[PDB]
């Protein structure tokens, strides 16, 4: 344990920065809840992912905790907390809030910590943030439970043949972080034609396929940033090119082109996959430097869209500089918020797309915005022909949305699901 009491006093903000593998989920979290239950405080616990929520349920074995897909402790995902507050008829209160993996730059995660920070600064709760890389200044090589030898090497950015023998001559298991699902597939194919087993983890596969890692012990896990929020990959080496995809609003559209250097918090979390056990020395092989200035990413606008609709609120204080507009800018009328919530939760829309649709379109039944956009917004398959579909009246449409978000058409979303919506089947 790190803190005694007073941590549950209204207006207290506590940051627990504990290294991975020193018993946070199964030692520290269960002691914090014991205290809450003993003091009879309505406690909220936020997990980043279903994988971590399930792990919390095992560690909180034998307490009155309510887990969400007569107890005073509720456990749910970051995203569940925020999505619930999008119904103004929703909005239960807790006096203590514990947020696990509180560094995540997912918009729901940013909005949750901002909302809870706002409440605690007004003395409506206590807030614990559990993360090795708290928002604010980060170190790329923070302390670990066991040794990590970190070395800079050139890392392949796609398929290779010769010149990188150190990758495949290695005897232990490796996690290789990649900036995108597409780049992952290239790396995965090359490793497999060099005789290695590979599992790919990303936004799309993580919830389902995390368990194959433990079960199948592949030579390589080729992973996106999805493994930076509590994933135990049980590897002895990380390979980290220190890049990520850069979703950005450019000329009124969300683009996904090229990469950014990771933030130092990301680099530390990637490295943080190893060094979990004392008595053994692991390896972190990386290429190049970090860039902490991610203020350009659309995630901050999306965090504001959510925060303005679950609520003067601020982001979690160091992050407030990254709020792109005046607080409240994106607030919707109750009726439009209901549309917004449906698009997020039932149609798998990004916050950016769901906001533009709900703010602007007349009725929840209109689909004409999906074909009435400017010509340059038309959506192509990888084969080069523009996507077409039929409206219920048999009219042939070209997919050409008024608001274009590249994330709807690749990187773990399929054109086919968006066409289900556009054709009025969803």
Residue numbers in the entry: 182 to 250, 260 to 501, 507 to 621
Authors' text:
The apoNS3H protein crystallizes in space group P41212 at 1.83 Å. The refined model of apoNS3H (residues 173–621) is complete except for an N-terminal 10X-histidine tag region derived from the pET-19b vector together with a short flexible linker region between protease and helicase domains of NS3 (residues E173–Q181) and two nonconserved disordered loop regions (residues P251–G259 and T502–P506). Nonprotein positive 2Fo–Fc electron density was attributed to water molecules. NS3H has a clover-shaped architecture divided into three domains containing seven conserved motifs of SF2 helicase family. Domain 1 (residues W188–E329) consists of six β-strands surrounded by four α-helices, whereas domain 2 (residues P330–G486) consists of three α-helices and six β-strands with one antiparallel β hairpin passing close to domain 3. Domain 3 (residues L487–R621) consists of four α-helices and one β-hairpin. The empty NTPase site is filled with solvent molecules, and the P-loop adopts a “relaxed” conformation as found in ZIKV structure, whereas DENV helicase exhibits yet more open conformation. The resulting 3D protein structure shows overall similarity with already published helicase structures of other flaviviruses.
The helicase domain of nonstructural protein 3 (NS3H) unwinds the double-stranded RNA replication intermediate in an ATP-dependent manner during the flavivirus life cycle. In this study, we focus on NS3H, which is a monomeric enzyme belonging to the DEAD/H box subfamily within the helicase superfamily 2 (SF2) and consists of three subdomains. The NTPase active site is located in a cleft between the subdomains 1 and 2 and involves motifs I (Walker A), II (Walker B), and VI. Here, we biochemically characterized NS3H from TBEV and obtained structures of key intermediates along the ATPase cycle (nucleotide-free, apo; ADP-; adenylyl-imidodiphosphate, AMPPNP-; and hydrolysis product, ADP–Pi-bound NS3H).
